[PDB]
């Protein structure tokens, strides 16, 4: 199960962590004219055992 | 109760940001790479029964 | 799974509508000028690839 969920971005890394950092820089630098943010999944896993 | 429609034509419209040709090519090259795939949920996702 | 819903009687036929809440998602890849390749997933209640 986990590579399927880490590959479809249901669990694991944030878009700010899996994307190549050049694209992350480009996104931040152009975000007021042409916003690429809505095009990448951010997972939000809940705290499990404690 | 007698209502009817006819469609005369469908056209597709599209609009482009006029982005600088080497910049857009630099963005394109970044987005063609398997680390940088775009991904999306059904925006209020479920299986409907 | 079983679910039993108790519901008020109505003189006309009606439906229970369920949403099994789920992750229904896609990932989309664009590696050359001519092409697009999409992977879908739906984690509970799957339907293949």
């Amino acid at each position: 199960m986990m590579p399927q969920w880490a590959y479809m971005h249901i669990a694991g890394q944030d878009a700010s962590e899996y994307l190549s950092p050049g694209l992350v820089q480009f996104a931040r630098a152009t975000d007021t004219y042409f916003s690429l943010g809505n095009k990448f999944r951010n997972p939000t896993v809940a705290p499990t055992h404690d | 109760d007698g209502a009817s429609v006819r469609f005369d034509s469908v056209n597709l419209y599209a609009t482009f940001f006029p982005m600088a040709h080497n910049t857009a090519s630099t963005l394109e090259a970044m987005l063609r790479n398997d680390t940088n795939d775009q991904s999306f949920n059904d925006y209020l996702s479920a299986a409907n029964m | 799974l079983d679910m039993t819903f108790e519901v008020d009687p109505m003189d006309e036929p009606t439906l229970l509508y369920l949403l099994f809440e789920v992750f229904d998602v896609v990932r989309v890849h664009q590696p050359h000028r001519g092409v697009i390749e999409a992977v879908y997933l739906r984690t509970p209640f799957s339907a293949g690839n």
Partner: peptide, 22 residues
Amino acid sequence: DINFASLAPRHGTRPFMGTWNE
């Protein structure tokens, strides 16, 4: 029930926008 997007913000620099290494 599930909206999300890439975000680790910065405004315009001393250049302001568009030229994108520091």
